[PDB]
Amino acid sequence: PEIVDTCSLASPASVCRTKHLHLRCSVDFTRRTLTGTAALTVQSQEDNLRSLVLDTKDLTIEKVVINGQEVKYALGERQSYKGSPMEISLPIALSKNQEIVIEISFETSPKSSALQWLTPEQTSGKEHPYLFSQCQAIHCRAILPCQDTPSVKLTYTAEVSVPKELVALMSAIRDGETPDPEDPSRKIYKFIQKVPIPCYLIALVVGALESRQIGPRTLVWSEKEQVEKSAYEFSETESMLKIAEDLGGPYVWGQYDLLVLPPSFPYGGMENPCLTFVTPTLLAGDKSLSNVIAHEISHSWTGNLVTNKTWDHFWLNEGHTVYLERHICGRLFGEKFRHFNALGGWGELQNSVKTFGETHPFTKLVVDLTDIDPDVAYSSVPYEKGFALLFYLEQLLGGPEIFLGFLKAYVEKFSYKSITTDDWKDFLYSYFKDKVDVLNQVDWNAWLYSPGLPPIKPNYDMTLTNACIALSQRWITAKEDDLNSFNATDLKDLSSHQLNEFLAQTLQRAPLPLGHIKRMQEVYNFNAINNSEIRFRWLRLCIQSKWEDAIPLALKMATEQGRMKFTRPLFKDLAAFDKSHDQAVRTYQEHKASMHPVTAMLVGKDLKVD
Ligand SMILES: N[C@@H](Cc1ccccc1)P(=O)(O)C[C@@H](Cc1ccccc1)C(=O)N[C@@H](Cc1ccccc1)C(=O)O
Ligand SMILES: [Yb+3]
Numbered sequence: 084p085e086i087v088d089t090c091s092l093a094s095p096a097s098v099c100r101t102k103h104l105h106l107r108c109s110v111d112f113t114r115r116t117l118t119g120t121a122a123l124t125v126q127s128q129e130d131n132l133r134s135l136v137l138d139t140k141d142l143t144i145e146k147v148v149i150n151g152q153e154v155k156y157a158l159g160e161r162q163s164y165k166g167s168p169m170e171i172s173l174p175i176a177l178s179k180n181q182e183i184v185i186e187i188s189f190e191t192s193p194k195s196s197a198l199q200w201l202t203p204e205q206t207s208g209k210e211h212p213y214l215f216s217q218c219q220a221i222h223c224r225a226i227l228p229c230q231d232t233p234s235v236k237l238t239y240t241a242e243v244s245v246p247k248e249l250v251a252l253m254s255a256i257r258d259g260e261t262p263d264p265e266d267p268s269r270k271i272y273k274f275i276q277k278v279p280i281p282c283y284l285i286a287l288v289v290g291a292l293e294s295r296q297i298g299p300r301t302l303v304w305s306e307k308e309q310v311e312k313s314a315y316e317f318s319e320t321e322s323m324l325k326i327a328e329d330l331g332g333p334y335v336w337g338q339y340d341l342l343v344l345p346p347s348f349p350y351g352g353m354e355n356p357c358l359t360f361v362t363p364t365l366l367a368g369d370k371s372l373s374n375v376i377a378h379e380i381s382h383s384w385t386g387n388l389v390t391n392k393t394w395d396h397f398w399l400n401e402g403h404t405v406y407l408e409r410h411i412c413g414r415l416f417g418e419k420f421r422h423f424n425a426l427g428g429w430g431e432l433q434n435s436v437k438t439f440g441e442t443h444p445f446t447k448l449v450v451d452l453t454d455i456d457p458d459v460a461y462s463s464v465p466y467e468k469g470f471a472l473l474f475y476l477e478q479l480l481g482g483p484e485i486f487l488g489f490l491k492a493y494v495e496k497f498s499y500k501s502i503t504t505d506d507w508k509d510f511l512y513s514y515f516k517d518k519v520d521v522l523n524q525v526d527w528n529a530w531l532y533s534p535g536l537p538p539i540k541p542n543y544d545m546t547l548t549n550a551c552i553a554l555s556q557r558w559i560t561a562k563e564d565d566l567n568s569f570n571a572t573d574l575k576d577l578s579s580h581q582l583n584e585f586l587a588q589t590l591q592r593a594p595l596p597l598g599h600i601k602r603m604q605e606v607y608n609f610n611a612i613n614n615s616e617i618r619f620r621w622l623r624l625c626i627q628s629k630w631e632d633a634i635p636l637a638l639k640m641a642t643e644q645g646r647m648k649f650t651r652p653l654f655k656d657l658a659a660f661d662k663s664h665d666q667a668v669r670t671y672q673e674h675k676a677s678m679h680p681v682t683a684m685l686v687g688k689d690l691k692v693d
């Protein structure tokens with residue numbers, strides 16, 4: 084089938100394939116640049132190959148060397164968020180399967196969309212600066228020239244020169260450290276990734292990092308001030324990894340370390356191989372937000388081993404990971420708990436479809452991302468519509484034990500490969516060939532290609548959800564004369580997850596009367612809850628219900644951390660409230676330069692500014 088990666092301007096995998104990258108670079112904090120060489124080992128997939136094209140974005144190319152000599156290259160015109168193509172003229176034509184090494188000298192821009200450079204004042208320690216990357220989806224080309232498409236998988240080695248007071252880490256096994264032979268104020272850290280990965284999984288952090296061991300194959304890394312809290316927060320990681328291995332097969336990556344980033348990290352987690360990145364907004368104090376780690380761990384099979392061939396097929400990465408994530412939680416906390424989370428995920432799917440509109444092309448499972456920035460299209464849809472389809476199939480095909488056997492087999496079949504929705508579907512029909520009649524009842528075209536809510540809602544146990552719905556409806560249907568009957572005892576039999584779901588339910592019906600929201604603070608004292616998910620929902624409820632007192636609390640949360648799940652809707656809610664609109668816009672303008680590049684772009688679009 085003719086599948087191209089419409090988000091890449093590089094030569095496709097049918098023309099040539101990168102096999103290995105050897106990255107030698109130096110991190111320059113005074114200039115905010117990464118400098119050095121990327122040597123790509125490339126295999127021709129064609130006869131008489133004489134040129135190839137690489138993805139770049141805001142990179143300065145000094146030179147390209149093949150067989151010890153400089154070769155001609157040309158940078159094409161920028162194609163907005165896709166960057167500029169780099170055509171390289173090979174010095175000798177290559178036969179099919181012939182491999183050569185191309186060494187490219189380059190330097191990044193300070194405005195690389197892959198990178199956030201943090202001043203010492205943006206860190207916990209306040210002495211040293213800090214750098215972290217975020218390559219997914221198509222930002223690797225903003226760090227190094229590459230075939231920036233998940234259809235191509237490579238191994239890599241790297242040597243990273245950094246100020247000696249600082250530590251470098253990568254999505255790779257640590258392979259030693261030395262003083263820098265060309266500067267005794269610098270150290271070189273070395274890295275090896277022996278399992279082939281798509282380039283979106285290359286990751287780098289440089290900062291004042293310490294580690295603590297928390298399991299036989301896990302260290303947690305953060306600035307010194309966060310280490311003790313992180314070790315406790317994530318102490319269940321080894322248990323979860325064991326359950327994940329039971330579901331998916333051997334963990335093949337060696338180490339499973341965790342890095343807790345500074346507050347501007349845009350995501351809850353990122354599944355960088357060997358080194359999952361996490362937001363410090365997870366540090367609730369009671370391990371209640373551990374589903375993020377379950378999700379990242381699950382990507383070590385679905386995403387990192389079996390990878391989407393192009394971003395149009397992103398739901399294969401996320402839907403299966405959610406499905407695995409919810410099984411880990413179900414093993415740990417019971418099947419009624421898995422149904423609670425699944426039911427919550429349907430509510431999130433309703434929110435996202437309501438927000439985009441029920442005919443919008445982004446609510447489709449398989450999307451067409453030609454001339455669409457993946458960062459713009461990013462939503463809960465591939466997560467929850469993908470999970471729903473899997474949960475529906477589970478129920479159709481005979482239950483969780485049966486469907487988990489399909490999942491283990493799917494992972495074995497496609498490990499180390501990149502696949503499309505049609506590969507998945509073909510294998511699903513192969514695996515369940517004795518149930519094809521059942522499969523043929525599925526409305527494939529609706530599920531995979533039609534926008535809006537799915538054509539069929541799965542069955543959900545409601546047991547843990549009922550108390551949330553009941554309390555939410557009491558508040559929604561309350562009149563002024565009913566407010567007196569609410570009391571802090573209403574909350575006594577609710578877990579933190581149930582409190583979150585109470586606020587989610589109520590938020591879906593927002594605004595509530597201002598008197599209701601004030602009563603809620605009076606009796607539940609939600610302003611005191613530090614848990615970031617609960618606090619985020621409470622603040623949105625307060626702002627959407629037009630409570631002015633909440634304006635400074637909402638602005639503070641929106642700006643003191645940068646997790647987009649929180650910062651984007653808080654800014655949007657503050658902009659839609661007339662009392663805070665000017666302050667929202669002004670606060671964005673003031674903070675923008677020190678925000679993450681991607682977060683700044685999206686919040687900017689959300690507010691209709693710059
Ligand atoms: N590959 C990572 C996703 C990614 C990063 C960069 C470019 C493309 C794709 P990823 O590992 O699933 C991150 C996920 C991790 C996650 C998802 C669901 C449950 C738990 C964890 C997460 O961070 N999503 C947000 C909230 C959110 C969920 C779903 C849709 C939109 C927003 C958050 O939690 O801030
Ligand atoms: Yb009444």
Ligand SMILES: [Zn+2]
Pocket residue numbers: 378382400401404
């Ligand atoms: Zn994910």
